[PDB]
Design a protein around this ligand. Sequence first.
Ligand SMILES: N[C@@H](Cc1c[nH]c2ccccc12)C(=O)O
Ligand SMILES: N[C@@H](Cc1c[nH]c2ccccc12)C(=O)O
Ligand SMILES: [Mg+2]
Ligand SMILES: [Mg+2]
Ligand SMILES: [Mg+2]
Ligand SMILES: [Mg+2]
Ligand SMILES: [Mg+2]
Ligand SMILES: [Mg+2]
Ligand SMILES: [Mg+2]
Ligand SMILES: [Mg+2]
Ligand SMILES: [Mg+2]
Ligand SMILES: [Mg+2]
Ligand SMILES: [Mg+2]
Lengths: 117, 103, 20, 142, 56, 110
Amino acid sequence: ARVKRGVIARARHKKILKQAKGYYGARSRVYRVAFQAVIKAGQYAYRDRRQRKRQFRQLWIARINAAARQNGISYSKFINGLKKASVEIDRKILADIAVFDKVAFTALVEKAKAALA
Amino acid sequence: MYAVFQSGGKQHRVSEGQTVRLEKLDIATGETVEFAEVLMIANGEEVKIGVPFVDGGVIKAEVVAHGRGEKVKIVKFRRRKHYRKQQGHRQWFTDVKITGISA
Amino acid sequence: HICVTSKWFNIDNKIVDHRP
Amino acid sequence: MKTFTAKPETVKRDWYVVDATGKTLGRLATELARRLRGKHKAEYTPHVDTGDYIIVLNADKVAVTGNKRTDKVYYHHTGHIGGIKQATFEEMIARRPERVIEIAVKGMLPKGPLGRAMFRKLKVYAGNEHNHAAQQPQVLDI
Amino acid sequence: AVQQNKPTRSKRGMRRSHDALTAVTSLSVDKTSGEKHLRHHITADGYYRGRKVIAK
Amino acid sequence: METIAKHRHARSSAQKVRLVADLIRGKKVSQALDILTYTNKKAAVLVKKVLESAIANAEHNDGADIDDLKVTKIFVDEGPSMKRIMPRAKGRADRILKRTSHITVVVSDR
RNA sequence: GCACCGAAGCUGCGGCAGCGACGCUUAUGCGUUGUUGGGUAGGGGAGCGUUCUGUAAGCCUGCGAAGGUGUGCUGUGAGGCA
RNA sequence: GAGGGGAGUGAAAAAGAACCUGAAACCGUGUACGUACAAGCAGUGGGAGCACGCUUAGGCGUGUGACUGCGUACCUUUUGU
Ligand SMILES: N[C@@H](Cc1c[nH]c2ccccc12)C(=O)O
Ligand SMILES: N[C@@H](Cc1c[nH]c2ccccc12)C(=O)O
Ligand SMILES: [Mg+2]
Ligand SMILES: [Mg+2]
Ligand SMILES: [Mg+2]
Ligand SMILES: [Mg+2]
Ligand SMILES: [Mg+2]
Ligand SMILES: [Mg+2]
Ligand SMILES: [Mg+2]
Ligand SMILES: [Mg+2]
Ligand SMILES: [Mg+2]
Ligand SMILES: [Mg+2]
Ligand SMILES: [Mg+2]
C-alpha cells in the first residue's frame, strides 16, 4: 500500500508558518527557518512566564518604595512595619493604592510607622 | 469606594459593580458568594486590617459563569540532545460580578 | 530547451600544498 | 487587571534648580540620576521618561574628596591611529567644567535610547544664573 | 571574494534607492510651429527658434 | 471605467521595465505620452505601445474621452524566463536567463 | 545587631497524571488524602494521522466530493469537528 | 507584427489552446501602521501611539509595535560548541 504523503506534509508545514506570522524575512517565509523561529519563541515564553512574575514584583517594589520615601520612610522599614503591624498581610501589587489613592497609602505608612515605634 | 480581598491565593482591589476574574470556585453559575477575608476597605477614610482582615468586612458577589482561558503553549527543547516535548494548557476561571462591599 | 550538457571538471586546478 | 503604566502623552515633569557648590560630585549625581529617571514617583514605568527637568549651577565649584581633584583620570579615545587622550579632574574643571557633572550622571543614567533622552532634561551651567527663568525652576537641596 | 550570507530582499531594494529615473519637465514649445521638443534641439519638423532649418 | 491593456512575454527584465513604468504611475495620459517620448529606454517604447493600446481600448470599447483619462494603475510582473546556455570556458556552463516581463496598464479616470 | 531585596527552592490558589492507603462504592469510578512526575544512550506503557481490504448494493456527495485557502471551536499532544 | 481589449461560443474564458485542480520557494502593485541619534540569533515579557472594528462606554477584538526587561539559530559530533 503506497502512501502519497505530502498532503499531511504541508499540513505540518503550514501549521508552523502560521505560528511564525510576523517574524522578519525567512523567519516567516521559509519553513526550515520558521520551525526554529517558532520553537525558540516558545522557549522564551516558557521562561518569561516565570520572568513576568519577577519583573512585576520589582516594578511594584520600585514604586512602593518611592511612595514610602515620599511619606518619609524607606521600603525596608515600611514592609517591616506592616509585617509587625499586628500580623496583617497585603500584596505588594495591591499597594497599587500608591498610585491611585495616595491618602490611603500615607494612611498605610502611618499604620506601619506605629508598629515600629 | 473600593475594597480588596483574598481569593485565588491572590488579592484584588475592587469597586462594586465591577466584574473580576478569579481562580475557579465550586459555586453554581448563578449563585451568590461571600468573601469574608477582606484585607481593606476605603471610603473618605479607610479600614486597613489590624491583623489580616477587617472585622465587619465582607464582599458579596454572584458568580457569572465559569470558563477556560486562552490556550498557552508549553515548549521544551534541549539543543543537540535529541529531546523536546510540546504541551498545551488552558486553566479554569470563574467570573464574579461584585455587588457587596459592606463597609 | 536543448540546453542540457554539463561536463564539470575536476576541481578547477591551480595551486595549493599547504605546508607540510 | 493589569497594573498601571505611565504614558508619555501625560507625564508631569516640572523643573528645578540645584547648586553644585560645596556638594560632593556623585553623591550629587546619584540624586540627579534618580530624579532624572523618575525613580521617585510612579517611576513605575521602566519604559517611560517620568523624571523632572533639573538644572545645575556652579558646576565649576563642585567638590570631590581624596586627592581625586588632581588624580581622577577621565579618558576618551578619538577612534584614530592611537588617539587615547586623557585629562585630569582639575584639567576638566579648567576647560568646560560643566562636563565633570554631565559625564558623571550620564554614566549613572541607563544604557540606551531612553537613557539618552533622560539626559537631555539636565542643564548644567558653569556659572551662577541661568537663562531659563521661563521654566520657573523650583530650588531643591540634596 | 564572495558573500558569506545571502544579501536580503530588503538590502537589495536599499541599494536601488538611487537607481530611479527622472522625467524631463524642461520640455518646451517652438515659437513658429506648434511642436514640443527638447530645449536647444530641432523639432520633429525641422523648426528651431521659429526658423525653419532642415527640410527633413 | 478601468479599461486596461497589456503586453505579455515582452523581451525585457521587468526590473528594467519598471523605472519606466514608475515615471508614469498616476499621471494624466497626456503627460505620460510626452514623458515616454523623451525617455531614452527600450522599455519606454514598450510601455508606450501598451499605454497607447490601452487608450484606444478605453476609447473604442468603453466610454472614451481621453482628455479626462489618467494612468491610475500600472505594474509589471516578471514573466517566464527563457533558459539558454553559453559557455565560459573550460567546459563549464552558464545558464543565463533571458528574462521576460508582463507589462500591464490600467488607464481609467477615477 | 535588626531590617529588606533576591531562585523554576518552600508556601499559597487552580489543574493533570502514576503509585498508595481511607472512605463513598466494587463487568468500578468517585471523593478525599499522603506521595511521585529534570533527563542523553536506552528499556517499558498508551496513542494521533496517512494508504489500502472488509463492514459497504450501507452512509455522505452537483442543494457541491477530494485537493487548495481562510475562519471559529475543541483535545495533553500527534489531531479532530464545523 | 508580437501581444492585448471588446464581441461571440460555453455551465464555466477567472476552461483560450503557455488551457482541470493551480500549493510553496521567488517577484510586484495597493492600503494600515512603524522607520532617517541608532548598535548584536531579530524573538520573548512588558508596553504607549495609530488605523480599524466593537461595545454603549468601561485600560475589549484585529493589524502595526515607539520605548523597555531578558535573550549568542538548528543538526551532528563531543569532556565540552
Ligand atoms: N586549486 C585546486 C587544487 C589543486 C592543486 N593541484 C590540482 C590538480 C588538479 C586539480 C586540482 C588541483 C582546488 O581548488 O582544489
Ligand atoms: N605547493 C606549491 C606549488 C604547487 C602549486 N600547485 C600545486 C599542486 C600540487 C603540488 C604542488 C603545487 C604552492 O602552492 O605554491
Ligand atoms: Mg518567584
Ligand atoms: Mg573546449
Ligand atoms: Mg523536562
Ligand atoms: Mg484519499
Ligand atoms: Mg488551468
Ligand atoms: Mg528618531
Ligand atoms: Mg545595526
Ligand atoms: Mg551599546
Ligand atoms: Mg574535540
Ligand atoms: Mg557523550
Ligand atoms: Mg553554549
